[PDB]
Design a protein around this nucleic acid. Structure first.
Ligand SMILES: [Mg+2]
Ligand SMILES: [Mg+2]
Ligand SMILES: [Mg+2]
Ligand SMILES: [Mg+2]
Ligand SMILES: [Mg+2]
Ligand SMILES: [Mg+2]
Ligand SMILES: [Mg+2]
Ligand SMILES: [Mg+2]
Ligand SMILES: [Mg+2]
Ligand SMILES: [Mg+2]
Ligand SMILES: [Mg+2]
Ligand SMILES: [Mg+2]
Ligand SMILES: [Mg+2]
Ligand SMILES: [Mg+2]
Ligand SMILES: [Mg+2]
Ligand SMILES: [Mg+2]
Ligand SMILES: [Mg+2]
Ligand SMILES: [Mg+2]
Ligand SMILES: [Mg+2]
Ligand SMILES: [Mg+2]
Ligand SMILES: [Mg+2]
Ligand SMILES: [Mg+2]
Ligand SMILES: [Mg+2]
Ligand SMILES: [Mg+2]
Ligand SMILES: [Mg+2]
Ligand SMILES: [Mg+2]
Ligand SMILES: [Mg+2]
Ligand SMILES: [Mg+2]
Ligand SMILES: [Mg+2]
Ligand SMILES: [Mg+2]
Ligand SMILES: [Mg+2]
Ligand SMILES: [Mg+2]
Ligand SMILES: [Mg+2]
Ligand SMILES: [Mg+2]
Ligand SMILES: [Mg+2]
Ligand SMILES: [Mg+2]
Ligand SMILES: [Mg+2]
Ligand SMILES: [Mg+2]
Ligand SMILES: [Mg+2]
Ligand SMILES: [Mg+2]
Ligand SMILES: [Mg+2]
Ligand SMILES: [Mg+2]
Ligand SMILES: [Mg+2]
Ligand SMILES: [Mg+2]
Ligand SMILES: [Mg+2]
Ligand SMILES: [Mg+2]
Ligand SMILES: [Mg+2]
Ligand SMILES: [Mg+2]
Ligand SMILES: [Mg+2]
Ligand SMILES: [Mg+2]
Ligand SMILES: [Mg+2]
Ligand SMILES: [Mg+2]
Ligand SMILES: [Mg+2]
Ligand SMILES: [Mg+2]
Ligand SMILES: [Mg+2]
Ligand SMILES: [Mg+2]
Ligand SMILES: [Mg+2]
Ligand SMILES: [Mg+2]
Ligand SMILES: [Mg+2]
Ligand SMILES: [Mg+2]
Ligand SMILES: [Mg+2]
Ligand SMILES: [Mg+2]
Ligand SMILES: [Mg+2]
Ligand SMILES: [Mg+2]
Ligand SMILES: [Mg+2]
Ligand SMILES: [Mg+2]
Ligand SMILES: [Mg+2]
Ligand SMILES: [Mg+2]
Ligand SMILES: [Mg+2]
Ligand SMILES: [Mg+2]
Ligand SMILES: [Mg+2]
Ligand SMILES: [Mg+2]
Ligand SMILES: [Mg+2]
Ligand SMILES: [Mg+2]
Ligand SMILES: [Mg+2]
Ligand SMILES: [Mg+2]
Ligand SMILES: [Mg+2]
Ligand SMILES: [Mg+2]
Ligand SMILES: [Mg+2]
Ligand SMILES: [Mg+2]
Ligand SMILES: [Mg+2]
Ligand SMILES: [Mg+2]
Ligand SMILES: [Mg+2]
Ligand SMILES: [Mg+2]
Ligand SMILES: [Mg+2]
Ligand SMILES: [Mg+2]
Ligand SMILES: [Mg+2]
Ligand SMILES: [Mg+2]
Ligand SMILES: [Mg+2]
Ligand SMILES: [Mg+2]
Ligand SMILES: [Mg+2]
Ligand SMILES: [Mg+2]
Ligand SMILES: [Mg+2]
Ligand SMILES: [Mg+2]
Ligand SMILES: [Mg+2]
Ligand SMILES: [Mg+2]
Ligand SMILES: [Mg+2]
Ligand SMILES: [Mg+2]
Ligand SMILES: [Mg+2]
Ligand SMILES: [Mg+2]
Ligand SMILES: [Mg+2]
Ligand SMILES: [Mg+2]
Ligand SMILES: [Mg+2]
Ligand SMILES: [Mg+2]
Ligand SMILES: [Mg+2]
Ligand SMILES: [Mg+2]
Ligand SMILES: [Mg+2]
Ligand SMILES: [Mg+2]
Ligand SMILES: [Mg+2]
Ligand SMILES: [Mg+2]
Ligand SMILES: [Mg+2]
Ligand SMILES: [Mg+2]
Ligand SMILES: [Mg+2]
Ligand SMILES: [Mg+2]
Ligand SMILES: [Mg+2]
Ligand SMILES: [Mg+2]
Ligand SMILES: [Mg+2]
Ligand SMILES: [Mg+2]
Ligand SMILES: [Mg+2]
Ligand SMILES: [Mg+2]
Ligand SMILES: [Mg+2]
Ligand SMILES: [Mg+2]
Ligand SMILES: [Mg+2]
Ligand SMILES: [Mg+2]
Ligand SMILES: [Mg+2]
Ligand SMILES: [Mg+2]
Ligand SMILES: [Mg+2]
Ligand SMILES: [Mg+2]
Ligand SMILES: [Mg+2]
Ligand SMILES: [Mg+2]
Ligand SMILES: [Mg+2]
Ligand SMILES: [Mg+2]
Ligand SMILES: [Mg+2]
Ligand SMILES: [Mg+2]
Ligand SMILES: [Mg+2]
Ligand SMILES: [Mg+2]
Ligand SMILES: [Mg+2]
Ligand SMILES: [Mg+2]
Ligand SMILES: [Mg+2]
Ligand SMILES: [Mg+2]
Ligand SMILES: [Mg+2]
Ligand SMILES: [Mg+2]
Ligand SMILES: [Mg+2]
Ligand SMILES: [Mg+2]
Ligand SMILES: [Mg+2]
Ligand SMILES: [Mg+2]
Ligand SMILES: [Mg+2]
Ligand SMILES: [Mg+2]
Ligand SMILES: [Mg+2]
Ligand SMILES: [Mg+2]
Ligand SMILES: [Mg+2]
Ligand SMILES: [Mg+2]
Ligand SMILES: [Mg+2]
Ligand SMILES: [Mg+2]
Ligand SMILES: [Mg+2]
Ligand SMILES: [Mg+2]
Ligand SMILES: [Mg+2]
Ligand SMILES: [Mg+2]
Ligand SMILES: [Mg+2]
Ligand SMILES: [Mg+2]
Ligand SMILES: [Mg+2]
Ligand SMILES: [Mg+2]
Ligand SMILES: [Mg+2]
Ligand SMILES: [Mg+2]
Ligand SMILES: [Mg+2]
Ligand SMILES: [Mg+2]
Ligand SMILES: [Mg+2]
Ligand SMILES: [Mg+2]
Ligand SMILES: [Mg+2]
Ligand SMILES: [Mg+2]
Ligand SMILES: [Mg+2]
Ligand SMILES: [Mg+2]
Ligand SMILES: [Mg+2]
Ligand SMILES: [Mg+2]
Ligand SMILES: [Mg+2]
Ligand SMILES: [Mg+2]
Ligand SMILES: [Mg+2]
Ligand SMILES: [Mg+2]
Ligand SMILES: [Mg+2]
Ligand SMILES: [Mg+2]
Ligand SMILES: [Mg+2]
Ligand SMILES: [Mg+2]
Ligand SMILES: [Mg+2]
Ligand SMILES: [Mg+2]
Ligand SMILES: [Mg+2]
Ligand SMILES: [Mg+2]
Ligand SMILES: [Mg+2]
Ligand SMILES: [Mg+2]
Ligand SMILES: [Mg+2]
Ligand SMILES: [Mg+2]
Ligand SMILES: [Mg+2]
Ligand SMILES: [Mg+2]
Ligand SMILES: [Mg+2]
Ligand SMILES: [Mg+2]
Ligand SMILES: [Mg+2]
Ligand SMILES: [Mg+2]
Ligand SMILES: [Mg+2]
Ligand SMILES: [Mg+2]
Ligand SMILES: [Mg+2]
Ligand SMILES: [Mg+2]
Ligand SMILES: [Mg+2]
Ligand SMILES: [Mg+2]
Ligand SMILES: [Mg+2]
Ligand SMILES: [Mg+2]
Ligand SMILES: [Mg+2]
Ligand SMILES: [Mg+2]
Ligand SMILES: [Mg+2]
Ligand SMILES: [Mg+2]
Ligand SMILES: [Mg+2]
Ligand SMILES: [Mg+2]
Ligand SMILES: [Mg+2]
Ligand SMILES: [Mg+2]
Ligand SMILES: [Mg+2]
Ligand SMILES: [Mg+2]
Ligand SMILES: [Mg+2]
Ligand SMILES: [Mg+2]
Ligand SMILES: [Mg+2]
Ligand SMILES: [Mg+2]
Ligand SMILES: [Mg+2]
Ligand SMILES: [Mg+2]
Ligand SMILES: [Mg+2]
Ligand SMILES: [Mg+2]
Ligand SMILES: [Mg+2]
Ligand SMILES: [Mg+2]
Ligand SMILES: [Mg+2]
Ligand SMILES: [Mg+2]
Ligand SMILES: [Mg+2]
Ligand SMILES: [Mg+2]
Ligand SMILES: [Mg+2]
Ligand SMILES: [Mg+2]
Ligand SMILES: [Mg+2]
Ligand SMILES: [Mg+2]
Ligand SMILES: [Mg+2]
Ligand SMILES: [Mg+2]
Ligand SMILES: [Mg+2]
Ligand SMILES: [Mg+2]
Ligand SMILES: [Mg+2]
Ligand SMILES: [Mg+2]
Ligand SMILES: [Mg+2]
Ligand SMILES: [Mg+2]
Ligand SMILES: [Mg+2]
Ligand SMILES: [Mg+2]
Ligand SMILES: [Mg+2]
Ligand SMILES: [Mg+2]
Ligand SMILES: [Mg+2]
Ligand SMILES: [Mg+2]
Ligand SMILES: [Mg+2]
Ligand SMILES: [Mg+2]
Ligand SMILES: [Mg+2]
Ligand SMILES: [Mg+2]
Ligand SMILES: [Mg+2]
Ligand SMILES: [Mg+2]
Ligand SMILES: [Mg+2]
Ligand SMILES: [Mg+2]
Ligand SMILES: [Mg+2]
Ligand SMILES: [Mg+2]
Ligand SMILES: [Mg+2]
Ligand SMILES: [Mg+2]
Ligand SMILES: [Mg+2]
Ligand SMILES: [Mg+2]
Ligand SMILES: [Mg+2]
Ligand SMILES: [Mg+2]
Ligand SMILES: [Mg+2]
Ligand SMILES: [Mg+2]
Ligand SMILES: [Mg+2]
Lengths: 48, 275
RNA sequence: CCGAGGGUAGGGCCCGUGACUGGGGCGAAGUCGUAACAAGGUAGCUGUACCGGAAGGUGCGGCUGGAU
RNA sequence: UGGGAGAGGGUGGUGGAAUUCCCGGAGUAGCGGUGAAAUGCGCAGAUACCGGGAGGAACGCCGAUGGCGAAGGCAGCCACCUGGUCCACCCGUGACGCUGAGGCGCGAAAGCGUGGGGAGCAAACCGGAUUAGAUACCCGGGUAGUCCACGCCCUAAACG
RNA sequence: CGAUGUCGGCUCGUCGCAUCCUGGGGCUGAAGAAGGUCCCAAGGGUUGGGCUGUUCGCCCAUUAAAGCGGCACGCGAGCUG
RNA sequence: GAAUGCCGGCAUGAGUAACGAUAAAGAGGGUGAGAAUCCCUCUCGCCGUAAGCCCAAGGGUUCCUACGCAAUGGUCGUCAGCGUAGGGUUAGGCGGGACCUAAGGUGAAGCCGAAAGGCGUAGCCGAAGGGCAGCCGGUUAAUAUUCCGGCCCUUCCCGCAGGUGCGAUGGGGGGACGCUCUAGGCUAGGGGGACCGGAGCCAUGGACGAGCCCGGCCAGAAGCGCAGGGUGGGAGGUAGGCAAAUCCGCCUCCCAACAAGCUCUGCGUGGUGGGGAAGCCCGGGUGACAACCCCCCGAAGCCAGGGAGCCAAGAAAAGCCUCUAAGCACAACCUGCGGGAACCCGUACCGCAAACCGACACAGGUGGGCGGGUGCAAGAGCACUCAGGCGCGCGGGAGAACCCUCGCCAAGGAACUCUGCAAGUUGGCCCCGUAACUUCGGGAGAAGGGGUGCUCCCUGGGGUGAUGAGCCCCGGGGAGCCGCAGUGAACAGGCUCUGGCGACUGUUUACCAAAAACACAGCUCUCUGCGAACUCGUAAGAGGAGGUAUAGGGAGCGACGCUUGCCCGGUGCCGGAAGGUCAAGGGGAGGGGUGCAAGCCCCGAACCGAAGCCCCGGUGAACGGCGGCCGUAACUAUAACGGUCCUAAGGUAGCGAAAUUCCUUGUCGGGUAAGUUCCGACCUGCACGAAAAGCGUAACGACCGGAGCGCUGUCUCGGCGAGGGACCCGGUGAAAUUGAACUGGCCGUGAAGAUGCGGCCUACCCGUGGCAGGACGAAAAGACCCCGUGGAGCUUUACUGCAGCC
RNA sequence: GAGCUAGCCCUGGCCAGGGUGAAGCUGGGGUGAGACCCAGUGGAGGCCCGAACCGGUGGGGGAUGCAAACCCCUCGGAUGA
């Protein structure tokens, strides 16, 4: 049956991407926290 | 005169349609239409603010001339009578000797080929528009402005009309379609006659499908819901109202008046509606 | 081949009968009231409509086959 | 061919009296209603009076023992559209006539459907009386309806 | 109660005897035939159907008889539901 | 040493279940250390509206080749989507960008908000919509509309020639649109050919034939032909299209007008370029100098922006054309021609799947296009089969129980059971025929019955030709033939009578309920006069609505028919300039603290002072409510009638043992041999009743009752047979559970149901296939129940606040 | 967090084949004119049968599954809400 993950590259970049995060107070706290934790990736990789 | 169907389906037994007899042209003026942005009942927050809207036929908005004091003294020929999906009245296409083309809502008795004109000096004939103070007392009238130059607000739906009843000072007294008696400023424009398509109210939609074409989604009773949803929600089995009948938001809905009491226009309203 | 008729299926008409039910006729020694016949105590009758334990009442219109 | 009378019918308009309601003024101790009363209304200002407005229905006098129509039935006034009918002339046609099973149309009121309108009135209904009782008569309220358009209904002491 | 699944049916039995039938008896208001009542007796047997979820019960047609109870109101790691 | 403790390791179950669709395999040859499993050949089977082919997502080297097999692969492995390495993706014309706008997002101006931020006409961004120039063939191990070959084309720059008042982000035209149905003419695709080309074949009784088998085209500028789309021409007037305008709009006149003309597209032809089968031979060669023609069927595609009908009335913007403004008119633009210039990104491969989403090489999910032939009435259905692709990554035996899926059955025929649950029956097409009732549509495929193949002969109309033959579609009549049987296989309703509920088609608890629930046309109440009411938001702003009372919100009821009574005392809502109560504030009689004083400070009576409440009235399709007792009639019985208590008033019409009736299987009637159900009645309705509507109602229903006919393995009552498992052998090899165990019966006992205690009985040790009575067997710290001054959802005339409103 | 799901908004796409045969139109009949009747034409519909497609009615299987909702048979809708 139809499951929950239906990948879509535009949708991925436009929802979780660097520019969406930077647009918003909460999204900038995400990046701030992910940099402080030392994450290797700050937003999801999507091919584009 | 509304048209009926033979009962060759369950829904055609009762379905009725407008006869479209006054319609003489079946396409709108290209330069007088623009896209009508469907809302679904949702506001600029994306939130539903008028329930049960959406999914109706696509429509183009026809630009209607609700001023007409715009072109005082310039006569126009009634070129066509047309369908308008955005209103119950029919609309009439006017060719001004100017060369300008505009739409007005089609009065009862308008004829293509006749001329109409607006202004203080216009003859008192169907389709002409004058400031209220120049229309003889007793004339039935439509597309009435409420304040001068603000645009026709009253008596715009199919079959409706206002009647001039008297004069007092700068103001005229009107019997609005609701039966209310209201002072309206004499410099307000009106158009003589009643709005056409008076048989509109005799349409029997006939089936649930027909409401859907109109963008009317199903309306679900409060009594069919749960207490989280609605005052009438809940109860085992059917339930009577069990409290004063209320809206989804709790306010009583059988008689509770809701016009604001200290509203400035109260000074201009003589008698509340009848019936 | 036709064919008495038998068989399957579906219709039509008529008769008898049926828990129960509608009113009708008659009986008369009962209970309720008294609608009509006198101006019958609200003149009567009437088509219709709504109503009332009942006769009946009232509305609308009609008739005189109504007393004074 | 030339004339007449007429509430004959249909459509659009339009006048005044009166009732009720709304507004303004003036005014106060009751008004109303009946056989007599009570319910009702009224000092939260009624009734009676004056001015203004709204709205519906019906048309006083003329009006008669009258007129018209096939019957039902038709009554302010104006116009338009239209039917029947009588008279004089004795001009045209030449029995072209009478009746009429069926058919078709019309058909008071009440009633029905869809829409409108709603002043007065008023089934049902509520209340006051009357009365032995009073699901009535009389009184105070009052919804259909009564009015208009279109469609049905097709009855009558539709009687001379 | 850190779980002992419940009515009824089906399936499969097994046991008790306060015995429904068949076998053996005594008494009888036992002539015979048919019964009644009690005693001994559990070896075997104890039908099919209509109604109702029913157990039960009522009814139809039979029968030698159409017994009553226990087994976690026997039996859901056997089925149904 | 225990915490259903934590982490790790390792056991048991166990050589057990399983090895993932029952489309299926066999042999020969080869390779290799090793082969059911890799390669090759023959045979067999399966898909073929796919299980074949192409594209878009998504995936990201999985592609090709060489070398490998530890692990991955449910077995094996020499193989591979696996390991290592090398190679592979080529564009002005395909897609996207250097073009356009949609929702939406963003946002100069502007508006709002403690901050963060929220909005916001223009503008900008935003596509699978608009717009825009490439077709066919060849080539690689692997790319190709990209390379190559042939024939075409677009834009930009410059130049030449000719032409013109040139010039735009501004004006206008256009772009530009729905649904259903559909004409003419074509093309795609397909069928046939006694014709053209072709390697060859004659078998096994016959055939050297009008025999068999194979193939018989594709692209193509200008020109031309056929079929279509689009478009009126001239002058005069002009005040409108937010400047200008010669454009467009409007008026008038003339001609032309279903013709033409101009213009654009499709199709055909077209110089030219390609392709080219079976078979044979080792992907290639040959066939071949291949042939390349005629007839027929024919789209849902093309001409296209075609036509008609209809109501629910069907994007924008740019490209394009035209108009003019600044300007500039040696420029500029337009047309033709010539030369030059033409960027960035994607392109491999999988793509209904072993490469995507499902933890897996997972029977599930995944949008668009092509999807051949024959027969069955049609079709994308069904059976077979083409091209093409597969046999599903464990096998070999055996021939038990039992399970699954399947086939048949004597006699009976629902006796099964909660229920005909399940399974039979019926089954397409043509013809005959068809009831109650009905809203006149229907009910209806009612029901029920007849026909159905093949051969010969005769013939009717239609399409294509030509008006004929030929082809093709739909027929009709006669006469015969065969079988048990002719929709001979596959696909394809069982029917009827009668109740309840819901009018109807729809919708719902994703994953236990599809219903009588929700919705629904329709009915009624009510709010709302427009900066509407209402809704979201602190607000600005929005929706409502670019709507205006024939409209918009809320509520109930729920097609339609006939109807919808009585009670307004309580609650709600509506109306009420009186009166009562009424807070802040106003007022300040009077009183107090302090100071020597003026003075400063405080308390405070009457009186004035809103909504609200009290009070008066209205209001039921507003919340709701709608009685009791005694007595009375020629026999009993009952009570039309009278009396009396109470109430705001005492349930009307209609219906009633009901989706409601406790007693209850009420009673009577019907149906059955028999009927707690069902249908029809009665009425002492425990406890119907009129928009939480009452009573009916044709049609409808995978709803829930009752009955009958047909037919059956449902059953009496079971038997046999098939395949996939189970079983045995080879390969791989789990799981929950598990205090440890050397783990029998009875009768007792024991915390009250004992393998484990007592007495007694029975019992050699160990497995294998089976069955489920026990191990109070496993699973899940009982959902019931209670308890905790535990939680959470919900309600209200509980309390106390708050938003909102007055 | 709306790449599942619910609703709406914008823009595209899809629905084999067969059946029934409304309005209208034309012709004829009818009448004073009509209503209306009949035939032909026509092609309507939350019309009918049935694939794709969307569903999920009853049963059976599955139940440490092929699958944390699947499989077989059957069944509803299939121009429309
Ligand atoms: Mg998706
Ligand atoms: Mg992904
Ligand atoms: Mg994407
Ligand atoms: Mg995308
Ligand atoms: Mg996206
Ligand atoms: Mg982003
Ligand atoms: Mg990480
Ligand atoms: Mg790093
Ligand atoms: Mg992130
Ligand atoms: Mg009309
Ligand atoms: Mg109709
Ligand atoms: Mg019709
Ligand atoms: Mg009709
Ligand atoms: Mg119907
Ligand atoms: Mg119409
Ligand atoms: Mg019209
Ligand atoms: Mg608009
Ligand atoms: Mg809008
Ligand atoms: Mg927005
Ligand atoms: Mg937002
Ligand atoms: Mg909405
Ligand atoms: Mg309109
Ligand atoms: Mg209308
Ligand atoms: Mg309506
Ligand atoms: Mg609409
Ligand atoms: Mg609605
Ligand atoms: Mg509703
Ligand atoms: Mg509910
Ligand atoms: Mg909620
Ligand atoms: Mg709450
Ligand atoms: Mg609530
Ligand atoms: Mg409630
Ligand atoms: Mg309740
Ligand atoms: Mg409820
Ligand atoms: Mg209840
Ligand atoms: Mg409920
Ligand atoms: Mg409910
Ligand atoms: Mg309900
Ligand atoms: Mg309740
Ligand atoms: Mg209620
Ligand atoms: Mg209540
Ligand atoms: Mg409010
Ligand atoms: Mg105003
Ligand atoms: Mg015989
Ligand atoms: Mg009398
Ligand atoms: Mg008398
Ligand atoms: Mg009398
Ligand atoms: Mg009565
Ligand atoms: Mg009585
Ligand atoms: Mg009365
Ligand atoms: Mg009379
Ligand atoms: Mg006073
Ligand atoms: Mg008189
Ligand atoms: Mg007279
Ligand atoms: Mg003469
Ligand atoms: Mg009459
Ligand atoms: Mg009348
Ligand atoms: Mg009447
Ligand atoms: Mg009134
Ligand atoms: Mg009395
Ligand atoms: Mg009435
Ligand atoms: Mg009425
Ligand atoms: Mg008379
Ligand atoms: Mg327990
Ligand atoms: Mg445990
Ligand atoms: Mg347990
Ligand atoms: Mg004897
Ligand atoms: Mg004895
Ligand atoms: Mg003895
Ligand atoms: Mg025995
Ligand atoms: Mg024994
Ligand atoms: Mg029983
Ligand atoms: Mg019992
Ligand atoms: Mg009994
Ligand atoms: Mg016997
Ligand atoms: Mg027992
Ligand atoms: Mg017990
Ligand atoms: Mg018990
Ligand atoms: Mg038990
Ligand atoms: Mg028992
Ligand atoms: Mg048990
Ligand atoms: Mg069980
Ligand atoms: Mg059980
Ligand atoms: Mg167990
Ligand atoms: Mg067991
Ligand atoms: Mg057990
Ligand atoms: Mg059972
Ligand atoms: Mg159950
Ligand atoms: Mg310890
Ligand atoms: Mg444990
Ligand atoms: Mg554990
Ligand atoms: Mg542990
Ligand atoms: Mg642990
Ligand atoms: Mg182990
Ligand atoms: Mg073994
Ligand atoms: Mg084992
Ligand atoms: Mg091998
Ligand atoms: Mg090997
Ligand atoms: Mg091979
Ligand atoms: Mg095929
Ligand atoms: Mg991946
Ligand atoms: Mg490749
Ligand atoms: Mg590779
Ligand atoms: Mg390996
Ligand atoms: Mg290996
Ligand atoms: Mg492995
Ligand atoms: Mg595997
Ligand atoms: Mg090797
Ligand atoms: Mg592999
Ligand atoms: Mg290489
Ligand atoms: Mg190229
Ligand atoms: Mg550039
Ligand atoms: Mg843009
Ligand atoms: Mg913003
Ligand atoms: Mg694009
Ligand atoms: Mg392109
Ligand atoms: Mg080309
Ligand atoms: Mg390549
Ligand atoms: Mg030029
Ligand atoms: Mg448009
Ligand atoms: Mg478009
Ligand atoms: Mg459609
Ligand atoms: Mg055609
Ligand atoms: Mg071609
Ligand atoms: Mg063909
Ligand atoms: Mg031979
Ligand atoms: Mg042609
Ligand atoms: Mg001009
Ligand atoms: Mg070749
Ligand atoms: Mg050669
Ligand atoms: Mg040759
Ligand atoms: Mg098609
Ligand atoms: Mg319409
Ligand atoms: Mg359009
Ligand atoms: Mg736009
Ligand atoms: Mg200049
Ligand atoms: Mg560049
Ligand atoms: Mg490529
Ligand atoms: Mg593959
Ligand atoms: Mg699939
Ligand atoms: Mg594939
Ligand atoms: Mg994979
Ligand atoms: Mg596999
Ligand atoms: Mg798969
Ligand atoms: Mg093909
Ligand atoms: Mg077939
Ligand atoms: Mg077929
Ligand atoms: Mg099929
Ligand atoms: Mg084939
Ligand atoms: Mg296989
Ligand atoms: Mg074996
Ligand atoms: Mg199978
Ligand atoms: Mg048999
Ligand atoms: Mg039978
Ligand atoms: Mg039989
Ligand atoms: Mg049954
Ligand atoms: Mg069958
Ligand atoms: Mg069949
Ligand atoms: Mg019948
Ligand atoms: Mg009929
Ligand atoms: Mg029907
Ligand atoms: Mg039937
Ligand atoms: Mg044959
Ligand atoms: Mg088949
Ligand atoms: Mg069928
Ligand atoms: Mg059956
Ligand atoms: Mg029936
Ligand atoms: Mg029942
Ligand atoms: Mg019902
Ligand atoms: Mg339903
Ligand atoms: Mg329902
Ligand atoms: Mg109904
Ligand atoms: Mg309904
Ligand atoms: Mg429905
Ligand atoms: Mg449907
Ligand atoms: Mg659920
Ligand atoms: Mg569910
Ligand atoms: Mg769930
Ligand atoms: Mg669930
Ligand atoms: Mg289920
Ligand atoms: Mg469900
Ligand atoms: Mg259903
Ligand atoms: Mg529901
Ligand atoms: Mg409902
Ligand atoms: Mg109704
Ligand atoms: Mg709010
Ligand atoms: Mg705003
Ligand atoms: Mg708005
Ligand atoms: Mg707006
Ligand atoms: Mg509106
Ligand atoms: Mg409903
Ligand atoms: Mg309801
Ligand atoms: Mg009826
Ligand atoms: Mg009453
Ligand atoms: Mg009350
Ligand atoms: Mg009250
Ligand atoms: Mg009262
Ligand atoms: Mg209350
Ligand atoms: Mg003082
Ligand atoms: Mg002192
Ligand atoms: Mg006050
Ligand atoms: Mg009422
Ligand atoms: Mg009460
Ligand atoms: Mg109520
Ligand atoms: Mg007596
Ligand atoms: Mg009863
Ligand atoms: Mg009974
Ligand atoms: Mg009932
Ligand atoms: Mg009850
Ligand atoms: Mg009870
Ligand atoms: Mg009972
Ligand atoms: Mg009972
Ligand atoms: Mg009984
Ligand atoms: Mg039953
Ligand atoms: Mg039952
Ligand atoms: Mg009784
Ligand atoms: Mg309710
Ligand atoms: Mg109810
Ligand atoms: Mg009923
Ligand atoms: Mg019915
Ligand atoms: Mg249904
Ligand atoms: Mg159903
Ligand atoms: Mg069997
Ligand atoms: Mg067999
Ligand atoms: Mg077998
Ligand atoms: Mg087998
Ligand atoms: Mg076998
Ligand atoms: Mg062995
Ligand atoms: Mg041990
Ligand atoms: Mg124990
Ligand atoms: Mg023991
Ligand atoms: Mg022992
Ligand atoms: Mg021991
Ligand atoms: Mg001891
Ligand atoms: Mg011991
Ligand atoms: Mg022993
Ligand atoms: Mg066991
Ligand atoms: Mg077992
Ligand atoms: Mg044990
Ligand atoms: Mg056990
Ligand atoms: Mg146990
Ligand atoms: Mg716990
Ligand atoms: Mg516990
Ligand atoms: Mg517990
Ligand atoms: Mg638990
Ligand atoms: Mg407890
Ligand atoms: Mg406490
Ligand atoms: Mg405590
Ligand atoms: Mg709480
Ligand atoms: Mg679109
Ligand atoms: Mg379809
Ligand atoms: Mg036809
Ligand atoms: Mg037509
Ligand atoms: Mg349909
Ligand atoms: Mg259809
Ligand atoms: Mg259908
Ligand atoms: Mg299912
Ligand atoms: Mg089944
Ligand atoms: Mg089965
Ligand atoms: Mg199962
Ligand atoms: Mg399945
Ligand atoms: Mg299936
Ligand atoms: Mg269907
Ligand atoms: Mg279809
Ligand atoms: Mg449908």
């Amino acid at each position: 049956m139809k499951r929950t993950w239906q990948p879509n590259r535009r949708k991925r970049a436009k929802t979780h991407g660097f520019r969406a995060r930077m647009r918003t107070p909460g999204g900038r706290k995400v990046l701030k926290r992910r940099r402080q934790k030392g994450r290797w990736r700050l937003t999801p990789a999507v091919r584009k | 005169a509304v048209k009926k169907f033979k009962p060759y389906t369950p829904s055609r037994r009762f379905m009725t349609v407008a006869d479209f007899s006054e319609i003489t042209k079946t396409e709108p003026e290209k330069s007088l239409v623009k896209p009508l942005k469907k809302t679904g009942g949702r506001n600029n927050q994306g939130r539903i603010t008028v329930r049960f809207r959406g999914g109706g036929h696509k429509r183009l908005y026809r630009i209607i001339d609700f001023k007409r004091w715009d072109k005082v003294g310039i006569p126009a020929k009634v070129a066509a009578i047309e369908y308008d999906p955005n209103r119950s009245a029919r609309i009439a296409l006017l060719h001004y000797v100017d060369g300008e083309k505009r739409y007005i809502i089609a009065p009862d008795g308008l004829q293509v080929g006749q001329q109409v004109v607006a202004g203080p000096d216009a003859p008192i004939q169907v389709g002409n528009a004058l400031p209220l103070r120049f229309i003889p007392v007793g004339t039935v009238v439509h597309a009435v402005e409420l304040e001068p130059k603000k645009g026709a607000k009253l008596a715009r739906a199919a079959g409706t009309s206002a009647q001039i009843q008297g004069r007092e000072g700068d103001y005229v007294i009107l019997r609005l379609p609701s039966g209310e008696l209201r002072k309206v400023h004499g410099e307000c424009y009106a158009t003589v006659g009643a709005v056409g398509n008076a048989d509109h109210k005799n349409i029997v939609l006939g089936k649930a499908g027909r409401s859907r074409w109109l963008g009317r989604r199903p309306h679900v009773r409060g009594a069919a819901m749960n207490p989280v949803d609605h005052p009438h929600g809940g109860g085992e089995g059917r339930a009577p109202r069990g409290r004063p009948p209320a809206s989804p938001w709790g306010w009583q809905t059988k008689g509770l008046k809701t016009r604001k009491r200290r509203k400035p226009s109260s000074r201009f309203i003589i008698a509340r509606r009848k019936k």
